[PDB]
Amino acid sequence: SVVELIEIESAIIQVKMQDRTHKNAFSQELTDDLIQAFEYIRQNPKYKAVILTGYDNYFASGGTQEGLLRIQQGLTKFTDDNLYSLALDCEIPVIAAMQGHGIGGGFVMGLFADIVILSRESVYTANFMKYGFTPGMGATFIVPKKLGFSLAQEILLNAGSYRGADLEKRGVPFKVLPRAEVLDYAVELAQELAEKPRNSLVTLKDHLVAPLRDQLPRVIEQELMMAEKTFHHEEVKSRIKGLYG
Amino acid sequence: MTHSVVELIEIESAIIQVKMQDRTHKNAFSQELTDDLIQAFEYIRQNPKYKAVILTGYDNYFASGGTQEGLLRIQQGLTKFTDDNLYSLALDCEIPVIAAMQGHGIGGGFVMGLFADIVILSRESVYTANFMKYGFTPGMGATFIVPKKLGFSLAQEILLNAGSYRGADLEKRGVPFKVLPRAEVLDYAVELAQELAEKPRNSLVTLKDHLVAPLRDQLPRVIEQELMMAEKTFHHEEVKSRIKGLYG
Amino acid sequence: THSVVELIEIESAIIQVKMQDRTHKNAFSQELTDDLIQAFEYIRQNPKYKAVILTGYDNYFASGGTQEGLLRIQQGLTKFTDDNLYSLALDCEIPVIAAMQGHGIGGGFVMGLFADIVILSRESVYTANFMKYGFTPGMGATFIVPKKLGFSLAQEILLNAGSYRGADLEKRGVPFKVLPRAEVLDYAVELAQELAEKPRNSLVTLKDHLVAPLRDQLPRVIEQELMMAEKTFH
Ligand code: NA
């Protein structure tokens, strides 16, 4: 296992991503272990709040270079095995404690969490367009939904990198803390969430995210239409070989 | 007004101030406050000379939300959130309403103020959509107006976790509302009312109709969905225990 | 044609549109109206560019309707009609960066709100000031202001038509980058460079998706704005 599962207190579960070899890029291993961790959480009605973090300086790094090339060649899609919507499909609140870097799909996956916390010193980017890819994995839905239309245009079109400190200065609604405090803060917030009845938490998450769960599939189809027009050029293959990490 | 817990003052010829002054209940929705507030907005409706309304509290309180008895009657299913439509007073008013939140804004109190066209917070005061502390899902259109005014994301946190925030905390979090020291909040709302009053009433009524038409339109359905939520969560014994145990 | 707009090619893939009607302080004269439309047409006919920087001169980004034009409306004489300048950045096929190095007033502020990336100057003044003149807002203000600045700050901006410095907006948490004036255009140039690193067809395809709901919904909002304007001459 490359994802460890740590109960905190009575009803909090910490899904810690730790594929150290790949810096939390979506290796086959990290993919399957995440699916399994969330299926385990789905099957176990004790938990009231999930905390999803990485290890050391990485939250989640996005597609592996091979994984991206497989996408370029059309062997796979960004939406496979639904990694992208794990936190949205989870029935209890999920806090994405992004204590390290969040890159590409790694950032987008965390953005479907109900609560996202950033580290001041780490890097965040929705970097699809750096390779020529129009954004995938619901990025064109969840980036404006969480960060607002205007910041999303810049983030998505330019694919630039931002320190959590830069995003805090642009007015993001996410709590931004020094790396060393992100998990501690997440844990406190998780304990406050765990004070509520599980039924009230699920009933309210259902209702708050109903528009998302309703609209997302149509936004995915739209990204799939964009992807049909942009993903499959030779230039995209060159950008992936030439500019990956 | 009738109960004398709302004070109406004409600040200038076109500016009307609705001061909530239920000292006994700290501007919690007592029967008296409920009655006086409706009578006050109905007076505003019947006198179409004003251009701006300033909604404010007294001292350190803006509005405290349901009384403890009031919350207990809701969980026994004797009454509802909507019921008198207090939540939607500022949205129904045809002229712009400034919620001058000089003091604390709790529960249905906070929410009612967020339905104003302009909201101003006090730095030293406390704001909370605290329904969930008691085990209740939010009512009073909280799940519509809080995302609408503060954005989706900060709404998830405010609503799910029911925390308390000083106006400075919200300010630090990036809200769009002006945040000022308590002692400046009413002065600033008056200066703002005076600027609004530089316009023809008819432009102001016409513009607000256009701007809030999606809210007047969408709100009824969200109220429905929140009632449905209330049916699954409001009526357990543990809500009664949290109300009796965690405050009025 | 009128020389009140200057086009500079920054690199092959970057075009700078510089508003330069010094007599009118970049207010919407006939010359600046024509020239801007002719500049957006030239850009449309030349698919070599990947990014557009729209900017002003000195302390002026764009000043909106002219004193004269507004006065003529206030007393119908006439035509409350729609010139469609406000959407040049929206209809432009490639990303537009509004580098508002100077003041952005009324329809000049709004025109730049329809750009994909907006940059403000701390020192400059910004206002959707339609209602100062007794008018409900036009040119899509009531759509693009909430969309770019959030429902709440838009209610304030459009109802009261107040003036805000860059600095005030930044303290209220706007998502636009805010810089001292002397740094606004250089920062636009760098961002335009980063954008030009992308294949053009990726820029266009994404932009089309991102702004579809704005191109789709805008005409109805314009109809509503013309309605409101009609109801005001009671
Ligand atoms: Na899940």
DSSP string, C46-67: -TT-SEEEEE-BTTEEE-BS-H
- Tell me the β-bridge partners of C96: C52
- What count of CB pairs under 8 Å joins A to B? 70
The answer, for B202 touching chain C at a CB cutoff of 8 Å, is: yes
Give the three-class secondary structure for C220: helix
Q: For the packed helices C151-160 and C141-149, what is the interaxial angle rounded to 10 degrees?
A: 140
- Say yes or no: A1 and A41 in one domain: yes
Please tell me whether residues A24 and A76 are part of one structural domain: yes
Q: Do residue A156 and residue A204 come from a single domain?
A: no
Give dist(CA C166, CA B103) in Å, integer.
Answer: 29
Q: Looking at chain B from residue 219 to 248, which residues have their Cβ under 8 Å from any Cβ of chain C?
A: none
- Label residue C53 exposed, middle or buried (CB < 10 Å: 0-12, 13-18, 19+): buried
Cβ–Cβ gap B151/C153 under 8 Å: no
Measured between its terminal Cα atoms, the distance across chain C in Å is 41
Among C52, C144, C198, pick the best mutation site for testing chain A contact (most A Cβ within 10 A). C198
CA dihedral sign, ordered B4, B10, B14, B17? negative
CA dist A39 and C103 (Å) reads 55
In the β-sheet with A101-103, what is the strand arrangement from edge to edge?
Answer: A58-60, A101-103, A123-125, A162-163
In the structure encoding, which two tokens stand for residue A149, read together? 């239309």
Cα distance from C195 to chain B (closest Cα, Å)? 28
Distance from CA of C117 to the nearest CA of B (A): 20
Q: Strand (E) positions, chain C?
A: 5-9, 14-19, 51-55, 60-62, 96-100, 103-105, 117-121, 125-127, 164-165, 177-179
* Residue located via tokens 């009524």: B205
Determine the distance separating the centroid of ligand 1 and the alpha carbon of A33, expressed in angstroms: 12
Residues A167 and A227 reside in one and the same domain = no
Q: How far is the CA of A13 from the centre of ligand 1 (A)?
A: 13
User: A69: closest CA among A225, A223, A239, A221?
Assistant: A239
Give the integer Cα–Cα distance in Å for C209 and C213.
Answer: 8
Contact A29, A19 (CB under 8 A): yes
Strands of the B97-101 sheet, one edge to the other: B6-12, B15-20, B52-56, B97-101, B118-122, B178-180
Contacts of A35 (CB under 8 A, 6+ apart): A81, A82, A83, A86
Amino acid, single-letter form, for residue B81: F
Contact B76, B221 (CB under 8 A): no
Contact B203 C131 (CB under 8 A): yes
Query: Is B77 found in the same domain as B105?
Result: yes
Q: How many CA atoms lie less than 13 Å away from C18 in the CB half-sphere?
A: 17
Please tell me the distance from the alpha carbon of residue B7 to that of residue B24, in angstroms, as a whole number: 15
- Taking an 8 Å cut-off on Cβ atoms, the answer to whether B160 and A197 are in contact is no
Q: How far apart are CA C217 and CA C208, in angstroms?
A: 14
Q: Report the separation in Å between the CA atom of B8 and the middle of ligand 1, taken as the mean of its atom positions.
A: 53
Whether residue B137 and residue A172 make contact (CB cut-off 8 A), yes or no, is no
Q: What angle do CA A90, A91, A92 make, to 5 degrees?
A: 95
Whether residue A103 is found in the same domain as residue A149:
yes
Question: Terminal CA-to-CA distance of chain A, rounded, Å?
Answer: 24
Chains that touch C (3 or more CB pairs under 8 A): A, B
Which candidate, A9, A103, A114, places its Cα nearest to that of A52?
A: A114
> Is the Cβ of B152 closer than 8 Å to some Cβ of chain C?
no
> Do B213 and B151 belong together in one domain?
no
Residue B41 covered by a domain: yes
Contact C159 B198 (CB under 8 A): no
Show which of A123, A152, A180 is a domain's final residue: A180
The residues facing B178 across adjacent strands are B120
The number of folded domains in chain A is: 2
CA pair distance B59, C104, nearest whole angstrom: 40
Instruction: Kindly give the pairing relationship between strand C117-121 and strand C177-179.
Output: parallel
Whether residues A227 and A173 fall in one domain? no
For residue B134, the chain A residue with the least C-alpha distance is A196
- Helices C141-149/B201-233 angle, 10° precision: 50
- Domain extent, residue B31, equals 1-183
Output the CA B97–ligand 1 centroid distance in Å. Answer: 43
- Beta pairing partners, C23: none
Tell me if B195 is assigned to some domain: no
For B144, the token pair is 């519509």
Query: How far is residue A110's CA from residue A241's CA, in Å, rounded to a whole number?
Result: 26
- Amino acid present at B106: I
Residue whose pair of structure tokens reads 């994404």 in the numeric block: C206
- Say if residues B110 and B65 touch (Cβ distance below 8 Å): yes
Binding-face residues of C in 98-127 toward B, CB within 8 A: none
C-alpha of residue A85 to centroid of ligand 1, in Å: 7
Please tell me whether the peptide bond between C78 and the residue prior to it is cis, using omega within 30 degrees of 0: yes
Contacts of A194 (CB under 8 A, 6+ apart): A9, A10, A11, A12, A48, A49
By Cβ distance, the residue of B118, B151, B199 closest to C131 is: B199
Cα-to-centroid distance, A34 and ligand 1 (Å): 9
| In C81-180, alpha helices (H) | 88-91, 107-113, 141-149, 151-160, 166-171
Query: For the purposes of burial, counting CB atoms within 10 Å of the CB of A33, is it exposed (0-12), middle (13-18) or buried (19 or more)?
Result: buried
Q: Does a structural domain hold residue B225?
A: yes
Give the CA dihedral A31, A32, A37, A42, nearest 10 degrees: 100
Examine the domain organization and report whether B128 and B170 are in the same domain: yes
Sign of the torsion angle spanned by Cα atoms C94, B152, B179, A162: negative
Kindly state whether residue A35 falls inside one of the protein's structural domains: yes
- How do C5-9 and B178-180 pair as beta strands? unpaired
Q: Phi and psi (nearest 5°) for A110? A: -70, -30
Mutation for B interface: A168, A172, A202, A207, most B CBs within 10 A: A207
Point out which residues pair with C84 in neighbouring strands: none
Structure tokens at A80: 């496979």
Same domain, A158 and A234: no
CB contact under 8 A, C159 and B207: yes
Work out the minimum CA distance from A146 to partner chain B, whole angstroms: 5
Residue A68 in any domain: the answer is yes
Pair B126, B206 in one domain: no
- Chain C residue numbers with beta carbons less than 8 Å from the beta carbon of A226 are 205-206, 209
Among candidate residues C141, C171, C173, C170, the one with its CA nearest the CA of residue C157: C141
Report if residue A188 sits inside a domain: no
Nearest residue of C to residue B96, measured between CA atoms:
C159
Note whether A235 contacts C199, CB cutoff 8 Å: yes
Using the mean position of ligand 1's atoms as its centre, give its distance from the Cα of residue A99 in Å. 21
CB distance A156–C210 less than 8 Å? yes
Deposited experimental method: X-ray
Joined together, the tokens standing for residue A87 give 């936190």
Which regions of chain B does DSSP assign to beta strands (E)?
A: 6-12, 15-20, 52-56, 61-63, 97-101, 104-106, 118-122, 126-128, 165-166, 178-180
A186 inside domain: no
Assess if residue B56 is contained within a domain: yes
- Tell which of C189, C209, C214 to mutate to test the A interface (max A CBs under 10 Å): C209
Q: Which residues contact A182 (CB under 8 A, 6 or more apart)?
A: A53, A97, A98, A99, A117, A118, A119
Task: With H, G, I as helix, E, B as strand and everything else as coil, classify residue A73.
Answer: coil
Determine the 3-state secondary structure of A53 from DSSP: strand
- The answer to whether residues C184 and C99 touch, using CB atoms and an 8 Å cutoff, is yes
Specify whether the CB–CB gap between C106 and C145 falls below 8 A. Answer: no
In sequence order, the β-bridge partners of residue A103 are: A125
Interface residue of C130, C159, C224, C232 to substitute, partner B, most B CBs within 10 Å: C159
> What's the gap in Å between B162 CA and the centre of ligand 1?
24
Q: How far apart are CA B113 and CA B130, in angstroms?
A: 15
Task: Give the integer Cα–Cα distance in Å for C211 and A50.
Answer: 35
- What three-state secondary structure class fits C9? strand
State the SS3 of A151-213: HHHHHHHHCCCEEHHHHHHCCCCCEEECHHHHHHHHHHHHHHHCCCCHHHHHHHHHHHHHHHH
User: For the domain that residue B214 is a member of, what is the CATH number?
Assistant: 6.20.390.20
By CB atoms closer than 10 A (0-12, 13-18, 19+), residue B192 is buried
CB-CB contact of C104 with C124 (8 Å):
yes
Residue A203, chain B, CB below 8 Å: the answer is yes
HSE-CB of B136 using CA atoms within 13 angstroms: 29
A169/A238 same-domain check = no
